[PDB]
Design an enzyme around this catalytic site. Sequence first.
Site, PDB file in Angstrom:
ATOM      1  CG  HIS A  41      -0.415   0.571   2.710  1.00 20.05           C
ATOM      2  ND1 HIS A  41      -0.555  -0.769   3.591  1.00 20.05           N
ATOM      3  CD2 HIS A  41       0.208   1.530   2.860  1.00 20.05           C
ATOM      4  CE1 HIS A  41       0.901   0.038   4.384  1.00 20.05           C
ATOM      5  NE2 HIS A  41       0.616   1.362   4.470  1.00 20.05           N
ATOM      6  N   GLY A 143       3.591   6.353   9.874  1.00 19.97           N
ATOM      7  CA  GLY A 143       4.315   5.913   9.369  1.00 19.97           C
ATOM      8  C   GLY A 143       5.451   4.566   9.643  1.00 19.97           C
ATOM      9  CB  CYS A 145       3.594   0.396   7.452  1.00 19.51           C
ATOM     10  SG  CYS A 145       1.629   1.205   8.245  1.00 19.51           S
TER      11      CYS A 145
END
EC number: 3.4.19.12
Lengths: 306, 301, 4, 4
Positions: A41, A143, A145
């Site tokens: 993503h 932030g 991920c």
Amino acid sequence: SGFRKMAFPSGKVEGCMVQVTCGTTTLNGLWLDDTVYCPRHVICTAEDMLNPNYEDLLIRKSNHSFLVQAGNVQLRVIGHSMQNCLLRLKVDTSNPKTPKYKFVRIQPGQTFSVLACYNGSPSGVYQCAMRPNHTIKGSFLNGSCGSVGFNIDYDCVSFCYMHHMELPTGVHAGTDLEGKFYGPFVDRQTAQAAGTDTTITLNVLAWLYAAVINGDRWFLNRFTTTLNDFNLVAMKYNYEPLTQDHVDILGPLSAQTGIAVLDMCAALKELLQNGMNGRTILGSTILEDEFTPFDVVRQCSGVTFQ
Amino acid sequence: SGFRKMAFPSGKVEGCMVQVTCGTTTLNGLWLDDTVYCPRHVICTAEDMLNPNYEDLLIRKSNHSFLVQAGNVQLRVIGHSMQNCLLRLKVDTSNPKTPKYKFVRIQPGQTFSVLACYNGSPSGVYQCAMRPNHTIKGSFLNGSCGSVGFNIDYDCVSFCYMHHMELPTGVHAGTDLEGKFYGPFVDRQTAQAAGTDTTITLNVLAWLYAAVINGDRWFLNRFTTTLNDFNLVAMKYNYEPLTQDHVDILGPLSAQTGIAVLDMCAALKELLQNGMNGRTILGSTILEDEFTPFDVVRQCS
Amino acid sequence: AVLX
Amino acid sequence: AVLX
């Protein structure tokens, strides 16, 4: 003496953390040899989130559009593909800090260390357990991920988790290193929620063994119980049902201490029903459930890593 | 969201860990550039340990009775000297993994990460606080001495602790990296005991703010208190007296949450007086005190 | 104390 | 869910 929850030394993984950026979106990537792994993503923007067609969005992606940074060093992307929910970016440089490693998919209840990262920069490390409901109760902000969870065995890093998203109860979900989610979740900003959760009975028992090995044993008693009889009380207190498999996994700890698992279950039965009555166990007032049988051995046995 | 007892990533420190042996005794050392730092008690005999005179023990030793090892590899000792309670061993080659660093002495109540080590090898990392009584509730075994505590700011490692021993209540004692002990303790196997301890009030309040930042608002109340009336209460409860300095420190977190510090203090008074009622805050059923305001700010953001 |  |  003393018992702390402990994470693995994080250096081996720290050397693998990089920054991945697609337009306005930045998050973390894991750089092993000449591949960078990251949540797919990353190819989104603040709208593509609701329902992306990943197969289709990836089509319009060029190699030059992925900005990969390791410290002050931009890595030239020379390939890309998707593998389940991960992106696989090929880069022109093999990571010189690449440790011996493997990808594993952990089972519910099992623990790992999480290296919380932001902008490619490791910020913190902590120990957690994969909950029965296939989530982790982590600490993560925007932030984060791409951050990974792992174990170390000897000199080998077993990566088992990559962070993807935060559910409405503020708990977390992610995939293994093959891009397959733990639990039923999917990587879109749709309405999803974690299922009800239970206490990790296997780990509580393990921790109780750790208590005894450390000289904390006021809770033991002279009785035993059947497995079925234990599960009847246990489940009233929202404990995972205990299985024969679990009993066998407690084998080594039961041997070390000479306390049969079912004998320990009676002690746990009494603890749940009667509470602690002011006393403590390994310094705690509650029954800890994020230490596995293996965690206990490794700690009480002083295991180190090369 | 979420809140964990979080340690700094330990890699920068892992690259500095070495092993130090004198005769039969081996513990951990810290290798920075061309010096190795370790507990001086590495030189004591099974005898020595009760009433050792370290000047006297040190003069009887040569650069070469020190066996320094980086993993399997021996590092040649070309110089040794005592600095307060540490030995400094100059070796004949530099550690290319030496990070930016400084040596700092922390105040009680602050936190740091500990890299527990055995025979120069890392076991695990965990976060803790210097207790008001100068001890640490650590997780150490025989041979853990020389393991160090530290904080990290950017690329700079601030070393604040080196482990020296265990006290009778199983808590741990040690020095800064100048070799000065935290607390009244001395490096010898005499009867020593940790002094009274107190709850780190400033940290408990910070951890209450963390919880508000994370939707755990149940403990709040309509009341405020004065600093004095808070202290008259908390102190009945083994809590450190709270000062105006400590109030100011909480300013950032008070603003972010729009909850007055003295208001959070009123909430704290309630919880101490009335208990939690089976309830929990940020997962815990007790009030936690090993998170500084700084820890909360960095982690909650 | 126990030197550790 | 919130992608993070």
